[PDB]
Amino acid sequence: AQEFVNCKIQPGKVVVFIKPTCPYCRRAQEILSQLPIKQGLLEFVDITATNHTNEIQDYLQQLTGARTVPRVFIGKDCIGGCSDLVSLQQSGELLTRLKQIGALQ
Numbered sequence: 867a868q869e870f871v872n873c874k875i876q877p878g879k880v881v882v883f884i885k886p887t888c889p890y891c892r893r894a895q896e897i898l899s900q901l902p903i904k905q906g907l908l909e910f911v912d913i914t915a916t917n918h919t920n921e922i923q924d925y926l927q928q929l930t931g932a933r934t935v936p937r938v939f940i941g942k943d944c945i946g947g948c949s950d951l952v953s954l955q956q957s958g959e960l961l962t963r964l965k966q967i968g969a970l971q
Contacts, residue, residue: 867917867921867922867925868925868929870917871911871925876941876942877942878941879907880898880903880908880964881939882898882908882909882910882936882937882938882939883912883922883935883937883939885912885914885919886912888935888936890936890947890948893936893948894938894951895910897948897952897955898938898951901970902971903964903970903971904968904971907967907968910936932946932947934947935947938950940960940963940967941969945960945963
């Protein structure tokens with residue numbers, strides 16, 4: 867399953883692949899949704915609701931360098947997982963990363 871993730875991301879959206887069975891996806895949800903971002907851009911896309919985690923996660927491994935979730939895509943740039951997301955929040959690098967894609971408002 868390649869097209870699901872591939873077509874779900876675009877530039878000029880903050881797409882995030884998640885599963886509700888990751889405790890880490892709940893972190894990323896507050897972490898990201900705490901920040902003032904263009905309405906509709908933050909989209910937590912699911913990897914078990916409508917698909918095959920097992921396939922998509924492996925595809926994400928190839929496409930982004932890691933399979934483990936949450937997996938934040940700030941406008942066709944995968945920033946990494948929640949470990950990286952924490953740096954970019956605390957360092958503030960995330961804010962710059964986002965506003966390029968026309969997010970913060």
